[PDB]
A paper describes a structure:
The main protease of SARS-CoV-2 (Mpro, also referred to as 3-chymotrypsin-like protease or 3CLpro) is responsible for the majority of nsp processing, cleaving at 11 conserved sites along the polyprotein including self-excision of Mpro by autolytic cleavage of its own N-terminal and C-terminal autoprocessing sites. SARS-CoV-2 Mpro is a functional homodimer of two symmetrically disposed protomers that are each 306 residues in length (33.8 kDa). The active site of Mpro features a Cys145-His41 catalytic dyad, which orchestrates nucleophilic attack at the carbonyl carbon of the invariant P1 glutamine and the formation of an acyl enzyme intermediate central to efficient peptide cleavage. Using C-terminally substituted Mpro chimeras, we have determined X-ray crystallographic structures of Mpro in complex with 10 of its 11 viral cleavage sites, bound at full occupancy intermolecularly in trans, within the active site of either the native enzyme and/or a catalytic mutant (C145A).
C6 (form 2), C10, C14, and C13WT have also crystallized in space group P21 but with a distinct unit cell, two molecules in the ASU, and a unique conformation of the donor substrate (we term here form 2 - see also below). Interestingly, the others diverge from this canonical binding, we term here form 2: in C6 (form 2), C10, and C14 (crystallized isomorphously in space group P21 with two molecules in the ASU) the substrate sequence is kinked ~ 90° at the P3 residues and tracks instead between the dynamic Met49 and Gln189 regions. This altered substrate trajectory appears to be coincident with the close contact of the donor C-terminal domain in this crystal packing. P4 residues in all substrates except C5, which interacts with Gln189 Oε1 form a hydrogen bond between main chain NH and Thr190 O. In the non-classical (form 2) poses we observe here, the P3 side chains (Thr (C7, C13), Met (C10) or Arg (C14)) instead extend toward the S4 pocket due to rotation of the P3 main chain, perhaps another reason for the restricted sequence diversity at P3. In the form 2 peptides, P5 and P6 are redirected between Met49 and Gln189, possibly due to the dramatic shift of the Gln189 side chain, reminiscent of motions observed in the C5 structure to accommodate the unique P2 phenylalanine. We note this critical hydrogen bond is also conserved in all of our kinked (form 2) substrate structures as well as canonical poses, highlighting its importance in substrate binding.
Residue numbers in the entry:
A (entry chain A), B (entry chain B): 1 to 306
The structure:
């Protein structure tokens, strides 16, 4: 037993990570087959004019301006194109380690594994959830842009995030693998702020279900409530509304634990009104909302079926 | 910026994982060159009286009895022997994916990355700290035994832990790669309890530094204290006593923060008594003690040396 934030194994992703340098600017690229994808602001430099326009600056760059290295080997750029906020760098060598993959746009509330990288070299791995305000609470320094996030589904690496920038609040923003930002953000030197965030109600219920599976059940009561009355409570604590779709996604954890979803909502309603009473749940003094129902099941299993 | 529990990329380790099956028991193995390392209780059968004779089961078993799988490929065991609580299965093929590696005995307070496995097949990765009572707080199900914990140092993998079992309190126990258990535990079906766990004082300090580097400062104070003076307020509070060895270790964090360790100790003493008064530090409502100083440094940029 035991429950912990757990990243997907990063081996498949590590073999696609490369360093991209244009001028004195370096960041990370993702090498699949004969293409390297990377944030377009690799072409930005110090001596650029204020609030540059990427159209104009890329026009100055030739193939020979982009220096891509996969370890101690130079990949030769043979073509470049810009697709929204990412650069597609056609190279003359196919990555022999390209996994089965898909490009995916995750929804808010969902999690993914982040392979933070520097200078083309993977550095560490951890879980993030896409916040309802379309930011993630990551750990990224300068040189980490191009790091990707991803999930594994059977044999297929689903890439869902490429990191670009940090916001003044200290939270992070990036694109899908087509260069489309999550949230109202731009890879520009313009003032931006994350909007107000909300708590991912469905995730907190999954976490409480995980808590029960692991024997942490002090917060259960005989009580139950309705979907309407729970949501009237949730709204007042900045929790996002709970939909029947959410209730159904919690099915397997309710089947597994024997605790009906609306039973769980009553315990949660109670922790929201009266607090955690100095108690910790799974070693946390706060309510965790970055564990999806899938992430719990992934870690406990369904033992009804023998 | 930002601060997160971060596992090492697990790629170099995933290529070492294999599946070991003796009779009806299946757990994971570690395939380094031409040796597979695994827990000895893979040979245990519940049909045993219980108190096992591991040595004579080695005589009882032949090489045929051990089924080693790298994916769907079988490795013929050509030798088998016991070293403390670990099996060393000699196979006919040397692991072509063997990395540069050491075998190390971690010290209580140090951290490592656990690659959680079932059936030779990686499931996920997360950080653990070896607790002062020689347990770890992981997420391990039945069949997770044989999973390893490791640290990457350049391109050399330091294997420091192999998981064997779970204690009735929900924490986990294991050996180094030489089969020697961390702590007074044995791999038998007998009543065992972990001693009293204590907070790793040096690590809470390192964490408080990570917050200051990252922006969380409210806890700081112009107040000061001394070493024995701080260790008074702490020993009664179940904390590891702080030593001059720990002070020095935090040197670089103080150097970057310009905050003296004793000054940090003072505001930490203040944090023990008062409590956090509904306030968080780096997204946490309790003091985190599983970030070592070096773990912090790896997630910070250091203005000093330019």
């Amino acid at each position: 037993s035991g429950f912990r934030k757990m990243a997907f194994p990063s081996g498949k992703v590590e073999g696609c990570m490369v360093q991209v340098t244009c001028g004195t600017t370096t960041l990370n690229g993702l090498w699949l087959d004969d293409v390297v994808y990377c944030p377009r602001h690799v072409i930005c430099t110090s001596e650029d004019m204020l609030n540059p326009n990427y159209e104009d600056l890329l026009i100055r760059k030739s193939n020979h301006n982009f220096l891509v290295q996969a370890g101690n080997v130079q990949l030769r750029v043979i073509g470049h194109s810009m697709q929204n906020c990412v650069l597609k760098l056609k190279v003359d060598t196919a990555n022999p380690k390209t996994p089965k993959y898909k490009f995916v746009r995750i929804q808010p509330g969902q999690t993914f594994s982040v392979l933070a990288c520097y200078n083309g070299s993977p550095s560490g791995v951890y879980q993030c959830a896409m916040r309802p305000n379309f930011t993630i609470k990551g750990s990224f320094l300068n040189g980490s842009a191009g790091s990707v996030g991803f999930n594994i589904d059977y044999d297929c690496v689903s890439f869902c995030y490429m990191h670009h920038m940090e916001l003044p609040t200290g939270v992070h923003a990036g694109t899908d693998l087509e260069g489309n930002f999550y949230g109202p953000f731009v890879d520009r030197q313009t003032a931006q702020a994350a909007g107000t965030d909300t708590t991912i109600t469905v995730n907190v219920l999954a976490w409480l279900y995980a808590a029960v599976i692991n024997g942490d059940r002090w917060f259960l009561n005989r009580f139950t409530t309705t979907l309407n009355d729970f949501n009237l409570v949730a709204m007042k604590y900045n929790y996002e509304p709970l939909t029947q779709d959410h209730v159904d996604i919690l099915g397997p954890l309710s089947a597994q634990t024997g605790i009906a979803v609306l039973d769980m909502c009553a315990s949660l309603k109670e922790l929201l009104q009266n607090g955690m009473n100095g108690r910790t749940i799974l070693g946390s003094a706060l309510l965790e909302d970055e564990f999806t129902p899938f992430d719990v099941v992934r870690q406990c299993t369904f033992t009804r079926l023998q």
